[PDB]
Structures are given as structure tokens and as C-alpha cells.
Amino acid sequence: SSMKLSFRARAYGFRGPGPQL
């Protein structure tokens, strides 16, 4: 899982838009 940008996201911090997904 890394920096694609069409995600929920899941695990990182600041999520949906969520780097590093």
C-alpha cells in the first residue's frame, strides 16, 4: 500500500484524501 489516490483511506492519519493511499 503506497500513494495511488483513489482510496478510503485506511491507516495513515488524515484520511480520504488520505496519503499514502
* CA–CA dist 8, 11 (Å, integer): 10
* CA–CA dist 6, 13 (Å, integer): 16
| DSSP output for 1-21 | --S-S-S---SSSS-SS-TT-
* CA–CA dist 21, 5 (Å, integer): 5
**Cβ–Cβ < 8 Å for 10, 1:** yes
* CA–CA dist 10, 1 (Å, integer): 10
User: Cα torsion for 9, 20, 12, 16, to the nearest 10°?
Assistant: -30
Cis-peptide, bond into residue 19, ω within 30° of zero: no
Here the cell at position 9 is 483511506
